[PDB]
């Protein structure tokens, strides 16, 4: 009855992130996504399997994990992770291809904040849930479902917190994520990695960047901005830590908030959220829970 690798047939190459190649496959007539790792990538495969198997993790805005398995083709062994399949693929792909309505933008932002709030939330009790920080949030690591809502993916670099002992489950390495989205404190290495809240705050800075990417694509009266990655106007493609630090920490710049966003309430709310995610001081940033609340109030008012 359970989904296993031997019963899945690969059909189409989707793409590749840091570790593992993603394919679309068919399991008992249904589409699934499969991330394939080689035997020498066992540590990366196991860590992502471990994060996704966390108690109480499942949420509509977190990629639906199905299974971790091995598949021996007779010559070599592949290490597989299987999840739900989402035809639209990444939010990066979606925003490159489409413009969104005001409702569309709010749906993407609210779902992203709801997934991050769930990841971040500690649940104490018998079947608890440790707080989890992502460490690599970006538009290529968020997927868009058929209903126009998002789900967070790419949990391999995540860190989990144990409140009872105030410990993090791994000894975290510095500057692990995508350089473009690294928070100021990660870029200048002032982050206190012994305090778990530091990792949640750095995820919020990255979410603010993702909200900027979405807001650019919100078309009102046919008016919108072209798709760009944050800092497209200040750093080269594949920027180094030094290039990012000079812009974000030294010159203290952030992505530009265009004048046209003050002409619409939804865009004024989004711009305010971004500014409050971009503070250099991690302690001053909004929480994912507070953002979820503000956006839920906005979606209720808009009638989404
Ligand atoms: F484009 C996609 C379309 N439909 C579904 C996922 C898509 N993309 C992705 N799939 C997976 C992935 C795939 C299978 C299992 C797992 C697991 F088990 F680790 F969750 N992950 N990781 C990703 N990281 C960034 C994007 C992305």
UniProtKB/Swiss-Prot annotation:
Cofactor: Mg(2+); Mn(2+)
Cross-link Glycyl lysine isopeptide (Lys-Gly) (interchain with G-Cter in ubiquitin), sequence positions: 71
Lineage: Eukaryota, Metazoa, Chordata, Craniata, Vertebrata
Organism: Homo sapiens (Human)
Functional description taken from the UniProt entry: Transmembrane serine/threonine kinase forming with the TGF-beta type II serine/threonine kinase receptor, TGFBR2, the non-promiscuous receptor for the TGF-beta cytokines TGFB1, TGFB2 and TGFB3. Transduces the TGFB1, TGFB2 and TGFB3 signal from the cell surface to the cytoplasm and is thus regulating a plethora of physiological and pathological processes including cell cycle arrest in epithelial and hematopoietic cells, control of mesenchymal cell proliferation and differentiation, wound healing, extracellular matrix production, immunosuppression and carcinogenesis.
Gene that this polypeptide is encoded by: TGFBR1
Protein name in UniProt: TGF-beta receptor type-1
Membrane topology of this protein: Single-pass type I membrane protein
Section covered of the full-length record: 200 to 501 of 503
Post-translational modification summary for this protein: Phosphorylated at basal levels in the absence of ligand. Activated upon phosphorylation by TGFBR2, mainly in the GS domain. Phosphorylation in the GS domain abrogates FKBP1A-binding. N-Glycosylated.
Expressed in which tissues: Found in all tissues examined, most abundant in placenta and least abundant in brain and heart. Expressed in a variety of cancer cell lines.
